[PDB]
Symmetry: D2
Subunit: 387 residues, 4 copies
């Protein structure tokens, strides 16, 4: 039961199942995986595709001949399995040169290098068929107040993204960008810390249509925010270009638990929203099998990500299809929320005594919302306990 299919579009970063287990306090617990291995194992589990940072696929500093051989082997694995590559990204965070940032490093020479490193990888992403290029500015930020003038840093971040937009336009590429917010870690505070801040920034770019967001479940939860609500705002803005799925237990370091772990009810409401809205992009997992696990546990954890999505999809669909739930949604006036407040226009509203002089506020205030009954129907559907 709950078998993944190609239409599910489940994808995984090479760095997810390939995470060797090094953490702030501990050495690696697993050997490095060949990307070819990961592609073949993920395909066996029913995944649709993989994603990569440049330096996951091609060791940093590789010669041109080494680069070609790494890409050739990877493409053979994709061809052998039918796996796709819908998204790629640049590693602008691991190497010590990026310790103060890539695009917003105080040192101008580093900013220029970061752009050249990204541009090289955009070319590769396009060659592999990627539709989306993600940017996670994990080093953009500060530990202290004097170290980073945020207005200047935002100017540099806009300059960088504008140059990348000019680049893809000039080459005729169809790829689009997706900015991944995170509030903190590894920097004390990261620039563009939430979906909202990233959406606001995009509106000030020269070609805003080329950029959207790549929100990650756990990153919004590291600020204690409601991830389904943030995804709803991204959808409302037309900017949900990609998504990263995982789990998180609240306001902690970024745990990258398998999807469904962490806040299970938020995972339910997320799947309900994505499916109801008809989100058509990859269901991408940015997760880490815990370092307690051997490789069998790696593949079990990856399988669990997909399984949990499919269980939640079933339960959310049953919730929305249940005539008792539909009745409860009407009892709670969800239908009214979807109707305009004043399609009659401002003057008609100003002239409407039913909106002011003759509005019976105490009668309105007496009406219950019936939200608790609705939520217990949702709980019963999630748990398969209807009756």
């Amino acid at each position: 039961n709950y078998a993944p299919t190609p239409v599910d579009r489940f994808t995984f970063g090479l760095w997810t199942v390939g995470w060797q287990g090094r953490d702030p306090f501990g050495d690696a617990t697993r050997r490095a995986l060949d990307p070819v291995e990961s592609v073949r194992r993920l395909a066996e589990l029913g995944a649709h595709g993989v994603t990569f940072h440049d330096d996951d696929l091609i060791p940093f500093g590789s010669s041109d001949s080494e680069r070609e051989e790494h890409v050739k082997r990877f493409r053979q694995a994709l061809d052998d399995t039918g796996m796709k590559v819908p998204m790629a990204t640049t590693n602008l965070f691991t190497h010590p040169v990026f310790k103060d940032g890539g695009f917003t490093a105080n040192d101008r020479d580093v900013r220029r290098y970061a752009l050249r490193k990204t541009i090289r990888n955009i070319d590769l992403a396009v060659e592999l068929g990627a539709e989306t290029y993600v940017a996670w500015g994990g080093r953009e930020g500060a530990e202290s107040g004097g170290a980073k003038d945020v207005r200047d840093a935002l100017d540099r971040m806009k300059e960088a993204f504008d140059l990348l937009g000019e680049y893809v336009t000039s080459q005729g590429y169809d790829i689009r960008f997706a900015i991944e917010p995170k509030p903190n870690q590894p920097r004390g505070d990261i620039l563009l810390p939430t979906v909202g801040h990233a959406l606001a920034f995009i509106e000030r770019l020269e070609r805003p249509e080329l950029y959207g967001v790549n929100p990650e479940v756990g990153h919004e939860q590291m600020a204690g925010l409601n991830f389904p609500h943030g995804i709803a705002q991204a959808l409302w803005a037309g900017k949900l270009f990609h998504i990263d799925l995982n789990g998180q237990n609240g306001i902690k370091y970024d745990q990258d638990l398998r999807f469904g772990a962490g806040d299970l009810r938020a995972a339910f409401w997320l799947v309900d929203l994505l499916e109801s809205a008809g989100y058509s992009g990859p269901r991408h997992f940015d997760f880490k099998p815990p370092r307690t696990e051997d490789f069998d546990g790696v593949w079990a954890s990856a399988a669990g990500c997909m399984r949990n999505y499919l269980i939640l999809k079933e339960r959310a669909a049953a919730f929305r299809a249940d005539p008792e739930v539909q009745e409860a949604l009407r009892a709670s006036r969800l239908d009214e929320l979807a109707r305009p407040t004043a399609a009659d226009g401002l003057q008609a509203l100003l002239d409407d005594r039913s909106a002011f002089e003759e509005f019976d506020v105490d009668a309105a205030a007496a009406r219950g919302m019936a939200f608790e009954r609705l939520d217990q129907l949702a709980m019963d559907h999630l748990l398969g306990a209807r009756g």
Copy 2:
């Protein structure tokens, strides 16, 4: 020392010093204050002005004659003291009719009433000389996932703000709107939970130039975010129309401590930013004297808000003026952060071997940022411990 002056533009809500001390668990500890009393006492402390919700100035449900008398008494107090009214707002949160929201209530009749209540108070705000009209949507949100379709709620919130913009345009008013984000409390999650989400929403309004943000120190800190960073993004966007100053100890219920309490170093960096950027708006305190206090403690707490701003202003100015700090800022390459990455343009960057093939990444990575020395100079300046 540290005496407030009119040019400081310190303002207070009537509901701040007037808070009677009722909390989720406790009855009022202070009697209600007449707004006339608050105006006269605040003026004696050196405040510039006050702000109000409609229902702070005019008891809910007042007749037209009662409304006129309340406003007349208030205006006499303003005239007697020279106090100004730079900002006003609507109470769309206390009355039970607003239990599911004002502008985004599921019930359409409530949404229409909320708009009419706001419009009436915009007229009054203009008559009193206010330049800014704040909206704090404290009831816009949910405790459960099925209760509120966030895309529909954002449609209703946009409709409401668009109607208000049409209204002020039609009347020829110069007032502008400022949206106040908050992540949670009193709703389990509030819509537009951060400065970023509010900035992003504004970009989708029909007349975006009429709307900005009113960020509150403690509200961003309730999501664990960096308040100076968020203010920097608002300034970068040209949207810092007003600000609410207070203190908060991290991720808790909204404490509304006096300004300078809570995160003292964030208060320092905030004042440094506002003064450096030339922010010209009110320095408004949205705070609550703790319910442990009698009226003498109320006025001491209000005085403390202003005193702490003025101490921090002095220390931040001394930091920026110190030639040793200026040298440290150059050692940390803050000057370089302010210079364009690639004013030479994209083609020149692509052709520049110094940005890629000839970039010595290990030499760049060896350079220290000297951020710790800079931050200890900042600490020494804040504490008056230079030497």
Copy 3:
């Protein structure tokens, strides 16, 4: 399905279903309930009993004749329904006199009054058959560092609890005390903020056997802590005298959502632990139907608390009884965790080369824990998705 029974021992505070909906920003949305009404309605839902603060049952300041009549009516309702009263507590937080505390108020006269108010209610609790007397020191704490010397406050808190222990001993009562920790709210920081701090404090009382803890799901989660882990430590110490069940979405104001809401997987692990350990006390709900609800929603929310406990009980029992789970627990060495490290004793351990010179650390480190497979079996059982 999932029908409560008397053996379930589900109990509710009068103040839960009776909460009128006043919050930091909003007036009451529901009329006050007569305790008689609440007893009869809760009995109809299958509850076992109720609990009370003194001032929930007897209006503050009542005459002796008024007190007798309130108690008489309440006892008739208990007799009419078969409902029990297993626990009572004192309200040392609502009245303004308690604004700086009860037992740890700086003013000695207030401390003495708080003790007398508690003692009067202990007598009533015993008359009603209560086995446990809870103390929630919600006003014990501070908003500022100079206001409360915590060592002195702990001396006063110990003195108070020691006097209460002397009192019950002197009267021959069998009741025992349960201290309810909370980290913050309504005070900026509350003394004894977690289960651990309360357990540690109890060990320093003169008669430690008379005191245990009353942990509340949401209160531990307001510090981001793992509630099942804290309950395990209380059980390990022999101190889980009572428990408060509800839901919470992380590090926020105390939400008091119905049980099962908030962190659903933590609710699952909690029920698993209570049932596995054979906890025999009340399953008490300290929750608040949201103020959006009318009375039908109040009773739906209360019913939901019990329903969710019973669903989770079923799923946790099925998890523990499944031979595949039992095999997975052995694969993860849970059996070994339960066996002594060194029952052979210290000298034998020091002499055992297999524990040091001949311990193959790399072979040990290669063994996977298989925790992800185990956790996905747990997820499948919770969701009823085995297969």
Copy 4:
């Protein structure tokens, strides 16, 4: 100004200034330091001593001859500088063998090895003159609910600490143990997550007098708790055997900022408490110079830890010595908080009409606490802005 002296007893872990800068996302930015270098540089800054994990001083897996040479070189550096070694600890977290714990690993063979590794290092600590042996159980915990039975784990943790107590008793050593709590990171939840939980656990050990706590500023703040309050409870219990000083910005990953950074006002209240209580132990810094820094920044950050302690010490002493503050403390009834509630005894309290029938609750409730004036005097003293 603010020059460290030997009587200040400032100490640093080898792993602090020696941290190479590897974080969850980034490679090392600094070369490894020879412990001899660190000892000599710290002495030049005015430090009193250093501390070590076994594997900081002796590379894991060293032969006996290698071990002797590493210790010999280190002792020569201590002798050359006058530096002391007041504390040592075991690394039971970095090596992959400890991925599920040391003392509470599910695998019994790992638990036995962890004990033998610790015992070997206790012998070395005693030879170097250490008075305290710290245990930070960073791997004791879980990411999932089924992986760790917490009651069984607490049994194993007690067994381990009891064996270590038997060991030191049998050898006649004067060293004592200090347990370092942390709520999470690197495990999803760590056992003994706060000072309170550790204090409670110690009370159940066979020889409780041999064990205390080593609280760390940032770790309590990772649960949003008040660090000075927790230190006060440890002092009240007689269990503050050692302390780790650093800074933290709230509920995030463990930042280990230099002391004084993070929550500056909490640092002030901490220093006030330690100095007022006469804490006589090391002022130990467990911090990490940010990875942005070169070695000059490492030593600047270490110097800053000590400088900030000394500034805060001066300001707290001036606060307590100021006759205006002493008057404000009396106005706020801090003197009364320190006096017994009922030294007259229980019967006298029960017979005292002034404590109940004749207690004027409304007159008592009218008295203000004057806490805001007191706190603004504290702020003025911290900032050196008296006047």
